[PDB]
A paper describes a structure:
In contrast, bacteria utilise the FASII system which involves a series of discrete and functionally specific enzymes that produce fatty acids primarily destined for incorporation into membrane lipids. FabG (3-oxoacyl-ACP or β-ketoacyl-ACP reductase) converts β-ketoacyl-ACP to β-hydroxyacyl-ACP in the presence of NADH or NADPH. FabG enzymes belong to the vast superfamily of SDRs that play a broad number of biological roles in eukaryotes, prokaryotes, and archaea, typically sharing 15–30% sequence identity and ‘fingerprint’ motifs. We provide high quality crystal structures for three enzymes: a functional low molecular weight FabG, a putative FabG protein, AbSDR, and a HMwFabG.
We also reveal AbSDR (ABO10977.2), a FabG-like protein with limited activity towards acetoacetyl-CoA in vitro. The best quality diffraction data for AbSDR was collected on the Australian Synchrotron MX2 beamline to a resolution of 1.9 Å. Overall, four protomers were present in the crystallographic asymmetric unit, each displaying high structural homology (greatest r.m.s.d of 0.158 Å). The quaternary structure showed a homotetramer with two interfaces: the α8 and β7 of opposing antiparallel protomers at one interface (A/B interface area 1363.5 Å, 1 salt bridge, 12 hydrogen bonds, and 184 non-bonded contacts) and the α4 and α6 helices of opposing antiparallel protomers at the other (A/C interface area 1642.5 Å, 4 salt bridges, and 22 hydrogen bonds, and 212 non-bonded contacts). Interestingly, AbSDR contains only one alpha helix (α7) in the flexible capping subdomain, which is conserved in SDR proteins. At the active site, three SDR catalytic residues, Ser140-Tyr153-Lys157 are present, and Ser111 creates a kink in the α4 helix. Superimposition shows that similar to FabG, the active site architecture is in an ‘active’ conformation, even without the presence of coenzyme suggesting conformational change may not be necessary for coenzyme binding. AbSDR has two basic residues Arg12 and Arg34 that suggests specificity towards a NADPH coenzyme rather than NADH, and classification in the cP3 coenzyme-binding subfamily. Functional assays did not show clear activity, unlike that for FabG where all available NADPH was converted to NADH in the reaction. We suggest the annotation for AbSDR remains as a putative 3-oxoacyl-ACP reductase.
Numbering used by the authors:
A (entry chain D): 1 to 188, 199 to 241
B (entry chain B): 1 to 192, 196 to 241
C (entry chain C): 2 to 188, 198 to 241
D (entry chain A): 2 to 241
């Protein structure tokens, strides 16, 4: 059976570019979105047109019990996921003393609760494939160095890095690599970027696609920055 | 007058060592504990015996509304804090598939909601002192490199680093430095050790005062050009 | 056709890089210090893969000889679109026991190698007016240091600094400059590697090949570790 | 009393380090490449603070001279408990425009300086049987690179790798080995282009003072910093 990869937030933007590149690489790809159902179906159709199998799942990554039920049912129907790309996240920018409770909690939970809620039901189905696996998280340059107006987002994306590195250590014995891709400023003050432009969605997706390939078998526990030389 | 520093989790261990070194350096130091009131009052009397003023505050850093009321009342009675040391944290170790919801949620929130719940009521009072300031968070080598059985704690302590660096950028123009201290294996962490000592180049656990000395240095006036940093105190582990 | 110089490509990691870049569609120029027959065999393999190839022989420490050979090669065959700098050797020993030669050979082969090879090639690369690729090979010991390798750790760390600075100078010409830092590669720390095995040469070469590809256009100034999760 | 060598200590950051260490109670040996009268001024200030001091003259690149002077000094005054390596120069320029001298003198002064100064002093330090302190001075350019400084970035990054490796070799001797990486500091002979670019990026919006760097070195040389080793500590106003 063909190896299948889940990409969260894959109805548009970076997530969609990742989904399409993984399909072109020969993976079956399961699309996900929180609410844009018609958009998710368009991506499913494009993946099918590439010759792979696809369908979409709808959930808010913060809804722990609903995510568990949807993923357990999907694994029962279609087998375990060989790969998981955790792409969905959220910003609520503002100066730290001006941040509301919602600005803080929604940003923290979407990245960190999302990591737990999506990956917890899928670790054992991945191990049961007995063929290794791939987990890639999407952080941010702000998770590496911090950013004004983004104490919450910098915390959420930095926490993702720590979770990724720790999980890489736990799953290494099962040949599951676990890595993080940290984009800079992407199209979806450029005076600080050495390449002097925003990045394109495919320039991020190509890195995720490489890490998901069999060729990247000795890369794990890493944060790979795709940021045009910003840091 | 005398600059005052809040140290969370200072009734014992590393937090206590930090509070006593900061008192010896000439700060007034406010002690904090979640629930061990008698322990906290003992540290208060030690700080008084070291020549500084002290009292304790009791709260769970996760209780957002309670923390705000307690800190806002304390600032009204005693003035803004010049410094805040965020030392209190929590572990719930276990392999990622073994972790319970509570194991995950309590570890993430204690560090990350603790940061928001304690610092949000205190940032503007600190700025209004108009004399700079100091914020030091306590992370962990696990936040830098990850650790087996600690996916939750690694995420919490790495998240603290991101928050620290971003806050450093916002507060630099007020001459408030914001830094992180990341201890390795310290004598107050209960372990069963022989493998860990083989990984540490110095081949021994750190002592509480070896961590507190770094925090004390960052809080000093001499550390005025150090901000946005993670300083590891780990015997060479990484 | 874009042409890439790979130093030290008659065997080992350098050979695997040369062959992967040939399979990707680049013309590849092979290099060796002295093993001429070995270099010719790699050239013949690149030709059998359908690309043009020849070899160049030089000690990377012979500054003037390197300049003459490379300037003549660029006049005969055009500027290099890419350069993979794979230059270094170890002379392990306790620091106070290292000889002058142990220190100077290790420092110079990596850092004078960088200067001696790249200085004559930067302007011919820019004059192609089509971007470019530079990849240097460092080591995990350049990132974190290693007992018995104060000299090698210094040389490898120095390559990382030179790479990051050169990335800043060349970004405006759309030349990316990156570093690949291998861990323990097959060419007893195994209880220390999470994947519990040495890397294979193609697991390093795959990362170099990805960085040289058009897809990697927003990645620059980076050190990418291929070390099985060692750090 | 414990004795510390500080190289390049006749002026600037090195002088600030030497005076802060003397105030902390170390005997301090001053070093300079060529300015003998400048060095003697610092010696006299350290003596006035109540510690023992003298100066040593050498180019850190002249390997055999460094070895003879240092081994003679250790025979006369005992081993050094601490060494602060403050060694390096810049020769800025676009990489294709760097001359052989621009490259070689920048690489060698930092990396050859590390080997030339420290190799004769490691065993005398170990033979004290009371631990020790080694601190190297790198730069933010060694951590992230800088335009016009491919040579300096390489030299200062190399210093970091050497420091971390030596920390591992000496950890069981209770000798800590660390690196301090200043950002843009007053008195630093830097180009206007490097200086203007740095100011816009520094969150504190100012250059550092020499004592803001020396205080970090002094802390690492103190007995309290005994569990800090293998580290690079940035003193850069938040630049990175």
């Amino acid at each position: 059976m063909t190896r299948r990869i889940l990409v969260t937030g894959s109805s548009r933007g970076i997530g969609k570019a990742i989904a399409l590149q993984l399909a072109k690489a020969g993976f079956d790809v399961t699309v996900h979105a929180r609410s844009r159902q018609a958009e998710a179906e368009q991506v499913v159709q494009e993946i099918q047109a590439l010759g792979q199998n696809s369908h979409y799942l709808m959930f808010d990554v913060n809804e722990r019990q609903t995510v568990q039920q949807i993923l357990e049912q999907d694994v029962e129907q279609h087998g375990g996921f060989y790969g998981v790309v955790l792409n969905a996240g959220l910003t609520h920018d503002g100066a730290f003393p001006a941040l509301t409770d919602q600005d803080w909690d929604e940003v923290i939970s979407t990245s960190l609760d999302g990591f737990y809620n999506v990956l917890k039901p899928l670790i054992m189905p991945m191990i049961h494939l007995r063929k290794g696996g791939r987990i890639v998280t999407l952080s941010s340059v702000s998770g590496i160095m911090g950013n004004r107006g983004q104490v919450n987002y910098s915390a959420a994306k930095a926490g993702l890095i720590g979770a990724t590195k720790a999980l890489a250590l736990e799953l290494a014995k099962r040949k599951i690599t676990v890595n993080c891709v940290a984009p800079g400023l992407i199209e979806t003050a450029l005076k600080m970027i050495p390449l002097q432009r925003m990045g394109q969605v495919d320039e991020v997706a190509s890195v995720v696609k490489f890490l998901c390939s069999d060729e990247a078998s000795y890369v794990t526990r890493q944060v790979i920055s795709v940021n045009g030389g910003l840091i």
